Design a protein around this ligand. Structure first.
Ligand SMILES: Nc1ncnc2c1ncn2[C@@H]1O[C@H](CSCC[C@H](N)C(=O)O)[C@@H](O)[C@H]1O
Ligand SMILES: Nc1ncnc2c1ncn2[C@@H]1O[C@H](CSCC[C@H](N)C(=O)O)[C@@H](O)[C@H]1O
Lengths: 284, 183, 284, 187
DNA sequence: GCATGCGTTCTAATTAGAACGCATG
DNA sequence: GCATGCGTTCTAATTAGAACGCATG
């Protein structure tokens, strides 16, 4: 009846938010296998977690035997690229072409990792994508995952808009979202010394810099020494809920770091979703 | 994915689920179905987007699941990968449970409507390379045990262009060693 | 009779190494007036010390009255730009032209800040510049400061070569330099996880990236995942002895941060020079 | 500072330190210097690079320190600012200590040899703007100097700046020396 | 009504990387 | 000792920033 550390498969791992959230919850992590192709994302996860993450490269090269050998897995998580699923891009290619079809790789590996019937062991999974997709894509995704998504907007627990869909079977996914004592809910809470926030919440941050100045006006969000300014990398990390300097890696500059942060998960949203896992696995 | 031969007296009429293309009139020619009862052993459906597991399960048990792309000279209604992923979706609903091992087969055929990397998605999802059976050709992924031209030839053949049922059916026969034969 | 906090004038302050070293020594800092021109150096000092530094801009606009009102000062420090004094640059307009003549501004304000003769009050000062200058320039500088310089190379206490001249009247400037328990003397001691140092000590780091690849070979100094790489900004901070992420400010990238760090002081050398001040001023 | 006038009987012969240029034969004309003293009260030196405070202190006391650029031309080897910074260096050595306040004066003149950036540092270091003394008469020759001094003796730069292009004038410096008759012996 | 956004694509800026250099030590 | 270095200049790219876009609601 004792608990063991959690064994995780994480596809499209990005900057290892999944691992970070688990460690922040005190869950003992026994294995974290991450599929990721971008070299600078991999550098972040590598350096910031001192080699605990096993990187396995392109999701499309993971084999049925790979899932057998690297497993068993207790938790299968992923969030696939939304370049072709979002409305934000005019040249959507949809769920079936371009990179939208990488979702089926998640669907595919999820089924390999699932325990066989008769095995009543715990097994949790979660898949995330953006809301700005068409109903046909949202319908087909939850045709393949056999369940419907929860929508969670980080505006409730962070200083920024970002509404996402989450499918999965984690305990309590549909429950209400409540802020914790240490959630930085206003933009001012995330700025460095001697900087003034013009807004309390900022529009959804993407990988491109034009998402940082707000609204139709395209106004710089910060005032410093009387002049307008954009947000800083440390301030972006704070908005998304990452540790300060999490992406200060591999000589990356403003652009590189915004790219990684803009496509990442909001840490406090993942914490909320992952928190019911504490009672199924080993704890620090 | 491999089954012992069944004795002839216990062979039973196959139950098949054919998606997108219909092989009913096809398969009766080989005596797998009995031309007679309208409520056949074969269930046909083309628009599978809103089919649920509970649909496939209440459509009764199946011994053969067959899916195929639309023919080449045809309107591409949906992306060519769509027929693949959907075929893979319901095939999983149709499989027998681990604790009930019964001869169970599946076939997927393409009309050369799938480009190269679509084929690499096909063979990782159906866990096998296809076999190219041929002027016109199709390629099949199948677990049934039946299964010489440059793909240069095939790829320039494809461009200048009718489902070629002619060609798929001969790979269907080895299922006679599991199901009843009608004469 | 008791000791009070130290009041500092810092000319050409750069990224506030002076203040950082003092706070790291436990010396109470009552006033720190810094003249500095570059906006991103100023951002570093501002944010990293939360407004304790009083910035006063161009050294050439500080007036004799300014020194009266901002003072008295206990410590006057400065390190003038070496664009025109180093032999590293073929175009050197010397001590008397270009920016080399900013030294005389230090000499000038030093005299304004000196106590009158009736005042036997404690008063310390220090001026730094590169060794790679003409003998005539070195002669004239210490004609104007009336004293000769100590040479201290950071290699005794750092993972990098950096030989500098220090004039001044601080206690014990001529004493031998000994490494302390927490000095990172080898390059390996400053790299991030999963990176291999090829050398133990690195050649002098300047503002331009060609100073990072070593010697005649111009070899990348690090191996990561089997391929060679240059140093990372956090590793540069560590070589110079700054806190990690000290320059992770104001959206600066690899180039900007190397510029600030390349013209900086070696923190452990300044600590050595400033350490005898603990017995003349208040301590926390 | 302002210095009260001397009664005429207490006036003494000036002790002066003149750098770069020599004003010896000049200053004798106004009787501040006297032609009898073989050990003159004027000390002249040109290469001041290795002059120390202890040199200045024993060559003095001094009551007047005078420095000047080379004349326009001369093929100056040294940067024009060099004469300024060195003059400022020694002047500090020569000043009286605070607890011994005596009449003490200093003068620096430039031959139009200093650019605008040099002149702005000139006036930051000598704590005053210069005054422009021109030469022009009935034949309207053109020649000028600018002086910095604490001596109570004390035009378009279009004209000056184009004057310079085409090419020592004691005539113009000498008249500013005579307000010092109120502090030192006359003839 | 009509405001938004885990982006691709142009061009115009910054920026990055090597040559270039000889006194000083 | 004969290599080194608190850099400026050139060019080759890197990258930055602004229009462009329409379905999801
Ligand atoms: N073929 C592939 N195999 C594995 N990862 C891939 C991939 N193609 C794209 N990716 C990666 O999938 C990620 C989708 S963005 C997801 C980021 C992640 N949710 C986070 O929390 O940081 C990107 O990092 C992209 O590099
Ligand atoms: N006219 C001026 N007034 C004040 N600072 C100036 C200046 N001209 C140049 N500077 C600054 O003087 C500095 C010389 S480099 C000195 C760096 C400093 N010792 C440190 O430890 O970081 C540079 O930051 C430069 O921007």
């Amino acid at each position: 009846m004792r608990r063991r550390p959690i064994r995780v498969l994480s596809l499209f791992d990005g900057i290892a938010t999944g691992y970070l959230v688990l460690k922040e919850l005190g869950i003992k992590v026994g294995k974290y296998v991450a599929s990721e192709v971008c070299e600078e994302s991999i550098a972040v996860g590598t350096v910031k977690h001192e080699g605990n993450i096993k990187y396995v490269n392109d999701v499309r090269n993971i084999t049925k035997k790979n899932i057998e050998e690297w497993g068993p897995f207790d938790l299968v998580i992923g969030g696939s690229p939304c370049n072709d699923l979002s409305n934000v891009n005019p040249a959507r290619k949809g769920l079936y072409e371009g990179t939208g079809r990488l979702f089926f790789e998640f669907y595919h590996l999820l089924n390999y990792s699932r325990p066989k019937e008769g095995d009543d062991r715990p097994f949790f999974w979660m898949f995330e994508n953006v809301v700005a997709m068409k109903v046909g894509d949202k319908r087909d995704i939850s045709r393949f995952l056999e369940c419907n998504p929860v929508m969670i907007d980080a505006i409730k627990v962070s200083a920024a808009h970002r509404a996402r869909y989450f499918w999965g079977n984690l305990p309590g996914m549909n429950r209400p979202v409540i802020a914790s004592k240490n959630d930085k809910l206003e933009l001012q809470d995330c700025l460095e010394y001697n900087r003034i926030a013009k807004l309390k919440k900022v529009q959804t941050i993407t990988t491109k810099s034009n998402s940082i100045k707000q609204g139709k006006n395209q106004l710089f969000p910060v005032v410093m020494n009387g002049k307008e300014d954009v947000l800083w990398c440390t301030e972006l990390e704070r908005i998304f809920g990452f540790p300060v300097h999490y992406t200060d890696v591999s000589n990356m500059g403003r652009g590189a770091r915004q790219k990684l942060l803009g496509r990442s998960w909001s840490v406090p949203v993942i914490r909320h979703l992952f928190a019911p896992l504490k009672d199924y696995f080993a704890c620090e | 994915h491999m089954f012992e031969t069944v004795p002839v007296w216990r062979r039973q009429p196959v139950r098949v689920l054919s998606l997108f293309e219909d092989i009913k009139k096809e398969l009766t020619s080989l005596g797998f179905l009995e031309s007679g009862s309208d409520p056949g052993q074969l269930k046909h459906v083309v628009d599978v987007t809103d089919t649920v597991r509970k649909d496939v399960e209440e459509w009764g048990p199946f011994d053969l699941v067959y899916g195929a792309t639309p023919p080449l000279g045809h309107t591409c209604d949906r992306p060519p990968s769509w027929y693949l992923f959907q075929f893979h979706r319901l095939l999983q609903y149709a499989r027998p449970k681990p604790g009930s091992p019964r001869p169970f087969f599946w076939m997927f055929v393409d009309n050369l409507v799938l480009n190269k990397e679509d084929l690499d998605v096909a063979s990782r999802f159906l866990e096998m390379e296809p076999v190219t059976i041929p002027q016109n050709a199709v390629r099949v992924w199948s677990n049934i045990p039946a299964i010489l031209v440059s793909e240069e030839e095939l790829s320039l053949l494809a461009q200048n262009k009718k489902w070629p049922t002619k060609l798929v059916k001969n790979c269907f026969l080895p299922l006679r060693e599991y199901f009843k034969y009608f004469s």
